[PDB]
Amino acid sequence: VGFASAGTRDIRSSYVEGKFIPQDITGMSRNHELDEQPSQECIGERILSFSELIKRNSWRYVSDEKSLIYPAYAFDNPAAMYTAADKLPVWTLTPRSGFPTLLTSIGAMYAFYRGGIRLKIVPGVADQPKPLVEVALFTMQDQGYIIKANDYSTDFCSSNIYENFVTKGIAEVQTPYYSRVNTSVVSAPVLYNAGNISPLMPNVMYKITSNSSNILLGHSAADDFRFGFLLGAPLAISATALRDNFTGSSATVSLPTFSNFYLS
Amino acid sequence: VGFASAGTRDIRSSYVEGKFIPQDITGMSRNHELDEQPSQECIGERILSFSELIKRNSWRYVSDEKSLIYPAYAFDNPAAMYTAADKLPVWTLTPRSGFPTLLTSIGAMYAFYRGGIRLKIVPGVADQPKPLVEVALFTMQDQGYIIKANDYSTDFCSSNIYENFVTKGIAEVQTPYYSRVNTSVVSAPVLYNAGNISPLMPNVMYKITSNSSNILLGHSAADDFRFGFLLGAPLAISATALRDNFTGSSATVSLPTFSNFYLS
Amino acid sequence: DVSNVITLPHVQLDISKETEVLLKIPYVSPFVQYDLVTKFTPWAAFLAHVYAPLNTPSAASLQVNVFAHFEDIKLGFPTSAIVAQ
Amino acid sequence: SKPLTTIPPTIVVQRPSQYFNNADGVDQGLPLSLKYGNEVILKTPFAGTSSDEMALEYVLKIPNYFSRFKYSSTSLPKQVLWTSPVHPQIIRNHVTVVDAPGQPTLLAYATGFFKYWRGGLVYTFRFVKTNYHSGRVQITFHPFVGYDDVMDSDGKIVRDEYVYRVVVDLRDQTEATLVVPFTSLTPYKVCADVFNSANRPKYNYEPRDFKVYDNTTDQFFTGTLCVSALTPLVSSSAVVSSTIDVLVEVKASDDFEVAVPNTPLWLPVDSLTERP
Amino acid sequence: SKPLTTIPPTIVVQRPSQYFNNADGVDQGLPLSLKYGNEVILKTPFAGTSSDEMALEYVLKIPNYFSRFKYSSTSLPKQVLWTSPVHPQIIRNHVTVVDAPGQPTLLAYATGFFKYWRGGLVYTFRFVKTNYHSGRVQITFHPFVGYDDVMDSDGKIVRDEYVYRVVVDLRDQTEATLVVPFTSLTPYKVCADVFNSANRPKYNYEPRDFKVYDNTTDQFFTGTLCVSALTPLVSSSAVVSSTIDVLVEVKASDDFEVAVPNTPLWLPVDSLTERP
Amino acid sequence: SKPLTTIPPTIVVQRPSQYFNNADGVDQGLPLSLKYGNEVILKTPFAGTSSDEMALE
Amino acid sequence: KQMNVNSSQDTTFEQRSQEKVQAGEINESIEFRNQITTFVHDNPIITEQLIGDSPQPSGDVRSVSDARTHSIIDFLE
């Protein structure tokens, strides 16, 4: 099409929309034309959208409360600190609502979202005598949109689902969008006064109860979920570098994974 | 249509039946014309009748008897007391047949009902060696239509259903209307002499037996259930205010919820 | 990092080639319209950052001017509420 | 013959109570009737009507008397005679007890089963007068403003040129009805619950006060409906009372809608008395 | 009647969470909505576009500014002015902290969710100059060679007769864009992770350095893209600066593809500060 | 509406690993791929032949 | 120009169509009007938007907009 120009020509939208078509350095567009053979012969699938990836579940948070109020639509990620000073752990992570998941990691690239989500729960202990888990829609206007041990004893007539840790083993829930608006804000700010009525997120949380002393919570997008308005790379650190221990202090960072959770 | 009139024009039935059509303050009826976009984009469903809500189950009563006679069609709600006097609990509730459920709370707005109901039972303990629960239709004419520990040892050939707390976890029952009349009375009065033959409610109760020391009972409307003759708001108090403790005495009111029941 | 500005919807200005550059942004927000009464929440911000420094033989400065206007306008409902300062 | 099975395996999901919280689905309960499929017909008419008394379109359209005010020879031009925030959590007072939350009207009780609401509200004003009382009053809708802001320090209405207004001439006329359309930046509002007037861990719940429309109240209502006098209500004191009562009723419009049914705001009780 | 069943048995498979890790399948979760089938529509447009902002074809085609270099009256013929390994794990520096791994660009973050990549990469060079600067530069692609090997000991490019090359004349022209096609012996390359610069059991992760294309680096990139001067950039020092900045942006071509999504290379954080 | 189920019961057979030792049948394993039905094509030719090198023949 | 331009005119060759001007200057430039302001540009310009840009859909605002419209004349009336 021409390698160079007098003035800007490679414009952000024009390229993505296919109106600006850069030339291959070899002059033969065939050299960068899609070839389907590789995925068919080597991979066995071909991923086309992050919409597919966020439907895969990942672990978000570990609770040590038998009955918990949990901020369903809070997509924030941990605060991180780094140091190369002697004898101090190199990396430290301090979560608010949980650790990063495919849902919150992909979400951090966008400003908005809409649609429902799914919840998965692994029990630390499947107690035979009291095997049930209840996940209830929690709507008290007074509650802050944060994690808190359940102290309520008056939330009658809620929407409840029951799963059995002994006969099944993992609890599976689907949460409707149930929003007062059609466009929510990813990691909207939660405040002291706030309560559970802000229009920036569905005014709905989870109340999770079981007889297991610990539970591992995970989530993913429901089938009607979407992220919108791409912003760019979110602030991030190398996940592999979390094993760093060059300061002489042993690495102490630990993400919520099944192996970390199930074994001590 | 005209904002004002000389004499009454806004008549109760005429408005509900669509014969009287009030004018929008803006003069454009389009401003109060139904828009389906909001529910489709934000909620994901659109509820049109309380008939839908009462089909959702809610918890009604907690029993500490292994074998119990329970008043199936009794829809009464608790007696309440209030005080702002120092050191006394602000609110106190005293149930007869149980606490309010969607079924009894919606029902309190009407005078009549007809149709069957459903029962759900959560066990305090799923005893492996003796895991069964029996729910039997109870018809002894002598029994008062009230909650009572089972002392009968001669009620042979009853209609029985069996559910397993270990292989399933929650017992599910459906009760036919089985009424001597086609219109029953919501929260009809139960008397001393009465027994189980009054025409105001189906002459049928439940006899529930299991080896769990405690059970949590819940209910909902069956598919052929209906409430009739709207009366208005029932006597009611703010559910959220039950947490009040401004008198210095800690709140002691506790509704039967799964979390209250399962954990101590 | 200007790299995080370049991934956003944006347009670039080369002072030796273009005289002016324009960016149009549609209204996007959880609120269907901007609240003139409580001012609760400006729906966007336009920012201009230096991508490559002003490069001249000796110290110099230029004025970067901004013109703006609204389009695809949708008005709210008649009210006596004050348009907040 | 007794051949080996050739049916392939099916993955199963163990469930204690499928559809427990749903209005729909297929219930798996064991029936207590002798005939498994026992079911009673849908009787029509029932309880005196052929109408569906359980439909929100029926329940929310029943009239709710919720307020009253006075209008007299003493009322001044532009004097605000009455105001009300526009929303459905309209409450009344418990008579035998002095709790702060109060008693819900049918509208508040019914919508209280849902967390969200939207739609128009119909208001009817019944002026209890004779044909010998004469005065003009104006009914105005002030979206996005609380009641302290529709009036100035003298109780006089302000900025009424800016709002939808109905100027009602009262001579022979005795009733006015109008629909206040839904006006909101969010498709749904929240059905207001009581709020804690104390500081945790202390709890003292009271009804919210919509004196101002700001970020601490705007998620619950759309603004204020107001009645102000244009003239005093004049009449001959030799034959009629100089002050009259005005009754107000509210009910839902055609587009009224509620969503997100969960923990109800109101709990029904069989009796309510003062604890000794 | 109550006949004996004649339905034959079915073999079943007990499963705690079928499709847990899949993008597809049929989810078995219990819905919290009142209507079991609750679902919100697919809104279009959404967030200002009718485009699919989640598609890799959209995300990976957003421009990534990732590097800059200088060109001046001082640059010598054949002098290498800039080089970059061709791959998508293009990183930036964290400003508030001095960790070695750094901050990923959008391209590195997004492709970081996958272990494999393949396809063409588009590079755009923006020469920030006036019409009074004059010079010729050449952009060359060196597959299978690291940056220490495109230059000799004097920083001069070598063997440029052997590679695809674009000779860019800069007088009025200010921008050059070209696609570097995928060139690999394996259909897929690996998205490079940091590597341990210490010896286990000690861990000190740092970004890989593609100075050489050999068996310790070739599984991550295809070679080196290079810009070298053919002439110095000349201009009158009486009126213009003698040195200019050249900005470089990279993005995916039409055939770009990623595969094997698993443990991500990058972890998002809400803040990053130095630990005291 | 929420009618009572009218589907009749099915007798089931609990099995830890159906077809474990068979060349055929339908495997019940949980796939580790993102797409549940991930599968690579049958490449022909492969390893230099169009012949079936696994056949006993 | 989806820049809701009231009018637009590329004036690059305008000087070439003046009768008393011979061999007129070819000067890249464009003039466009937006309501009461006219921009007279003396070089190339770039006009960008969101990828797949779509203005806010009208249905989104029914919850707050009045079905009746209001202009200056309406207010004075």
Q: What is the DSSP letter of C85?
A: -
Domain map of chain D by residue range?
1-276
Task: Determine, for residues D214 and C38 on separate chains, whether the beta-carbon distance falls below 8 Å.
Answer: yes
Q: Mutate which of A9, A12, A180 to disrupt the C interface (most C C-beta within 10 Å)?
A: A12
Nearest to E271 by CA among E125, E127, E95: E95
- Per the CB < 8 A criterion, the answer to whether G30 and C18 are in contact is no
Beta carbons of D221 and D183 less than 8 angstroms apart: no
Tokens describing residue D141: 């809708």
Whole-angstrom Cα distance, residue D200 to residue E135? Answer: 73
Chain B: give the shortest CA distance to residue F24, in Å. Answer: 32
Closest CA to E164 of E113, E211, E223, E219: E223
Measured CA to CA, the distance from residue D30 to residue A225 in angstroms comes to: 37
CA dihedral E79, E82, E86, E92 (to 10 degrees): 160
Point out which residues pair with D249 in neighbouring strands. Answer: D65, D124
Residue E14 and residue F14: Cβ atoms within 8 Å?
yes
| Contact indicator for C11, A11 with CB cutoff of 8 Å | yes
Contact B76, B104 (CB under 8 A): yes
Inter-chain contact F2–D9, Cβ cutoff 8 Å?
Answer: no
Query: Burial, B211: exposed, middle or buried (Cβ in 10 Å; 0-12, 13-18, 19+)?
Result: middle
Handedness of CA A242, A247, A251, A253 (dihedral sign): negative
Rounded Cα–Cα distance for residues D9 and E189 (Å) = 39
Number of residues in chain A = 264
The amino acid that residue B103 corresponds to is L
> Which among B212, E12, E117, B17 has a CA at the least distance from the CA of A128?
B212
Q: How far apart are CA B100 and CA B186, in angstroms?
A: 14
Chain B residues lying within 8 Å of G74, measured CB to CB = none
CA distance E95 to C49: 17
User: What is the full DSSP assignment across G22-75?
Assistant: SS------EEEEETTEEEEESS-EEEE--TTB-PPPGGGGTTTS-SS---HHHH
Q: Where are the beta strands (DSSP E) in chain A?
A: 4-5, 58-63, 67-70, 79-82, 91-94, 110-114, 117-123, 132-138, 148-149, 160-164, 171-175, 184-185, 205-210, 215-221, 226-230, 236-238
Q: How many other CB atoms are found less than 10 A from the CB of residue C36?
A: 13
Output the DSSP codes for D176-199.
EEEEE----SSS-EE-PPPEE-S-
- Judge contact between B219 and B55, C-beta under 8 A: no
Dihedral-angle region of residue B238 (phi above 0 means left; psi in -120 to 50 means alpha; beta otherwise): beta
Q: How was this structure determined?
A: X-ray
Rounded distance between C-alpha atoms, residue E243 and residue E239, angstroms: 12
Q: Which residue of E has its CA nearest to C30?
A: E47
- Given an 8 Å threshold on Cβ–Cβ distance, is B228 in contact with D22? no
Residues B15 and D253 sit within 8 Å (Cβ to Cβ)? no
- What the block records as the tokens of B214 is 């405690």
Backbone angles phi, psi at E82, to 5 degrees: -170, 150
Does domain D1-276 correspond to CATH entry 2.60.120.20? yes
CB neighbour list of residue A82: distance below 8 Å, 6 or more residues apart: A90, A91, A237, E97, E98, E99, E272, E273, E274, E275
Residue D72 burial (10 A CB sphere; 0-12, 13-18, 19+): middle
Q: Mapping DSSP to helix (H, G, I), strand (E, B) and coil, where does residue D103 land?
A: strand
Distance CA A144, CA D207 (A): 19
Q: Does residue B118 contact residue B73 with C-beta atoms inside 8 Å?
A: no
8 Å CB contact between B123 and B261: no
Give the span between the Cα atoms of E98 and E272, in whole angstroms.
11
| Whole-number Å distance between alpha carbons of A8 and C6 | 14
CA A86 to chain centre: 34
CATH of residue A200's domain is 2.60.120.20
DSSP letter (8 states) at residue A54: T
The full length of chain F comes to 57
**Nearest Cβ partner for F6 among D11, D23, D37:** D37
- CB neighbourhood size of A97 (10 A): 21
Pairing label, strands A171-175, E30-31: parallel
List, as one string, the DSSP characters of A2-29. -SEESS----HHHHHTTSS-PPBTTS-G
Token pair of A204, please? Answer: 């709905």
Whether the bond into E31 is cis, omega within 30 of 0: no
E170, E135 contact by CB (below 8 A): yes
Number of residues that this document lists for chain G: 77
Q: Are A96 and A78 in contact (CB under 8 A)?
A: yes
| Pairwise CA distance, residues A162 & A209, whole Å | 10
Omega before residue E201 within 30° of 0, cis: yes
Residue type at B162 in one-letter notation: Y
Residues of E with Cβ-Cβ distance to F10 under 8 angstroms: 7, 9-10
| DSSP letter string, F1-57 | --PBP-PPP--EEE-SSTTTT-SSS---PPP-SSSTT------SSBTTBSS-TTS--
Residues with Cβ within 8 Å of residue A226, at least 6 apart in sequence: A51, A113, A114, A115, E42, E43, E46, E54
In three-state form (DSSP H/G/I as H, E/B as E, the rest C), the secondary structure along chain B is: CCCEECCCCCCHHHHHCCCCCCCECCCCHHHHCCCCHHHHHHHCCCCCEHHHHCCCCEEEEEECCCEEEECCCCCCCCEEEECCCCCCCCEEEECCCCCCCHHHHHHCCEEEEECCEEEEEEECCCCCCCCEEEEEEECCCCCCCCCEECCCCCCCCCCEEEEECCCCCCEEEEECCCCCCCCEECCCCCCCCCCCCCCCCCCCEEEEEECCCCEEEEEEECCCCEEEEECCCCCEEECHHHHCCCCCCCCCCCCCCHHHHHCC
Contacts of D220 (CB under 8 A, 6+ apart): A197, D85, D87, D89, D189, D190, D191, D192, D208, D210
Q: Which H or E element spans position D271? A: strand D271-274
Closest to B75 (Cα-Cα) out of B54, B56, B97: B97
Q: Are D5 and E8 in contact (CB under 8 A)?
A: yes
List of chain A residues whose C-beta atoms are within 8 Å of the C-beta of residue D113: 157
Q: How far apart are CA B234 and CA D266, in angstroms?
A: 10
Q: Which long-range contacts (CB under 8 A, 24 or more apart) does G27-34 make?
A: G32/G1, G32/G3, G32/G5, G32/G6, G32/G7, G32/G8, G33/G5, G33/G6, G33/G7, G33/G8, G34/C69, G34/G3, G34/G4, G34/G5, G34/G6
The distance from CA D265 to its chain's CA centroid, rounded to whole angstroms, is 13
The Cα angle at residue G18 between residues G15 and G21, in degrees rounded to 5: 80
DSSP state of E162: G
Cα angle D260-D264-D269, degrees, rounded to a multiple of 5: 160
Largest Cα span, chain D: 109
Contact indicator for A29, E35 with CB cutoff of 8 Å? no
Q: How many CB atoms lie within 10 A of CB D264?
A: 28
Which residues in chain G touch residue C25, judged by CB atoms under 8 angstroms apart? 49-50
D187 chain-B contacts, CB cut-off 8 A? 37-38, 41-42
Chains that touch G (3 or more CB pairs under 8 A): A, B, C, D, E
Answer yes or no: are the C-beta atoms of B99 and A156 closer than 8 Å.
yes
Chain D nearest-CA distance from E34, in A, is: 5
- Total number of domains in chain A: 1
Please indicate if any CB of chain G lies within 8 Å of the CB of D182.
yes
Alpha-carbon gap, residue D52 to D50, rounded angstroms: 7
Contact G50 E49 (CB under 8 A): yes
How many other C-beta atoms lie within 10 A of the C-beta of residue F44? 9
Task: Please report residues of D whose CB lies closer than 8 A to that of C79.
Answer: 142-145, 162-163, 183, 223
The domain of B236 spans 1-264
For F42, other C-beta atoms within 10 Å of its C-beta total 7
- CA A256, chain centre distance (Å): 12
Q: Taking a C-beta distance cutoff of 8 angstroms, is the pair D89, D112 a contact?
A: yes
Torsion of CA B71, A136, A122, A227, to 10 degrees: 150
Q: Letter for the amino acid at B227?
A: F
Residue E22's SS3 state is coil
Contacts D25 to F, Cβ<8 Å: 2
DSSP letter string, D49-98: BSS-TTBHHHHTTS-EEEEEEEEETTPPTTBEEEEEESSS--EE--SS--
Tokens coding B194 = 């009465």
- CA–CA separation, B81 and B247 (whole Å): 14
Can you tell me the distance from the alpha carbon of B201 to that of B194, in angstroms, rounded to the nearest whole number?
A: 12
Q: Cis (ω within 30 of 0) for the bond into E45?
A: yes
What is the C-alpha to C-alpha distance for residues C38 and D215, in angstroms, rounded to an integer?
Answer: 7
Helical (H) or strand (E) element with E56:
helix E56-59
The span from the first CA to the last CA of chain C, in angstroms, equals 33
Contact E12 D13 (CB under 8 A): no
Cα gap A77→F1, rounded to integer Å: 42
Q: Are C6 and A230 in contact (CB under 8 A)?
A: no
Element (H, E) at E203: none
Beta bridge partners of A119: A173, A219
Q: Which helix or strand (DSSP H or E) is residue E135 part of?
A: strand E135-143
Query: How far apart, in Å, are the Cα atoms of E121 and each of A16, A124, E182?
Result: 14, 47, 8
CB E14 within 8 A of CB B167: no
> Which residues of chain D neighbour E15 with C-beta distances below 8 Å?
11-13
The candidate with the shortest Cα–Cα distance to B229, out of D48, D111, D64, D108, is D48
> In this complex, which of A12, A181, A232 lies closest to C30 when CB atoms are compared?
A181
Nearest CA in chain E to D36: E2
Burial of E79 (0-12, 13-18, 19+ CB in 10 A): middle
CA distance B41 to A177: 9
Identify the H or E element spanning A259.
helix A258-262
The strand pair at D223-229 and D91-92 is best described as unpaired
- DSSP H or E segment with residue A116: none
Q: CA of D185 to nearest chain G CA: how many angstroms apart?
A: 6
CA B225 to chain centre: 13
d(CA A207, CA A148): 10
Distances (CA, A) of F19 to B152, D117, E2, E99, F30: 53, 55, 36, 52, 15
Q: Are E81 and E228 in contact (CB under 8 A)?
A: yes
Beta partners for A238? Answer: E266
Alpha carbon of residue G65 to chain centroid: 26
Place of tokens 């005080």: B83
Compute the Cα dihedral for C1, C3, C4, C9 and give only its sign.
positive
Task: Choose the mutation target among E128, E242, E250 for the interface with C, i.e. most C CBs under 10 Å.
Answer: E128
